[PDB]
Amino acid sequence: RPNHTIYINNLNEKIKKDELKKSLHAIFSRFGQILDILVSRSLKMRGQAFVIFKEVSSATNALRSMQGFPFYDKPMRIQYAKTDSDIIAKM
Ligand SMILES: [Mg+2]
Ligand SMILES: [Mg+2]
């Protein structure tokens, strides 16, 4: 099931969509090249987001290292996405 994409839950829903994306990029880019970050109004309201890495190893390290990290006062809950974004094939 491990893939290039991590699905993040339990995100602070009071954070601005734009600021949230930027913060996610700052935090996760240290684990490897990020291809894309998915943060919509729908996802935001539910405290969810997706980060797509260029390599699966980067996704794995991110998942194992940032699990439970107090992001904006809330422990992040991270898992691999059920379906690896078709963006991988496209990009
Ligand atoms: Mg994008
Ligand atoms: Mg850990």
Swiss-Prot record:
Residues with PTM N6-acetyllysine: 54
Superkingdom of this protein's organism: Eukaryota
Parts forming coiled coils: none
Domain RRM: 4-83
Family from the record: Belongs to the RRM U1 A/B'' family.
Known function: Component of the spliceosomal U1 snRNP, which is essential for recognition of the pre-mRNA 5' splice-site and the subsequent assembly of the spliceosome. U1 snRNP is the first snRNP to interact with pre-mRNA. This interaction is required for the subsequent binding of U2 snRNP and the U4/U6/U5 tri-snRNP. SNRPA binds stem loop II of U1 snRNA. In a snRNP-free form (SF-A) may be involved in coupled pre-mRNA splicing and polyadenylation process. May bind preferentially to the 5'-UGCAC-3' motif on RNAs.
Protein name: U1 small nuclear ribonucleoprotein A
Organism annotation: Homo sapiens (Human)
Gene (UniProt): SNRPA
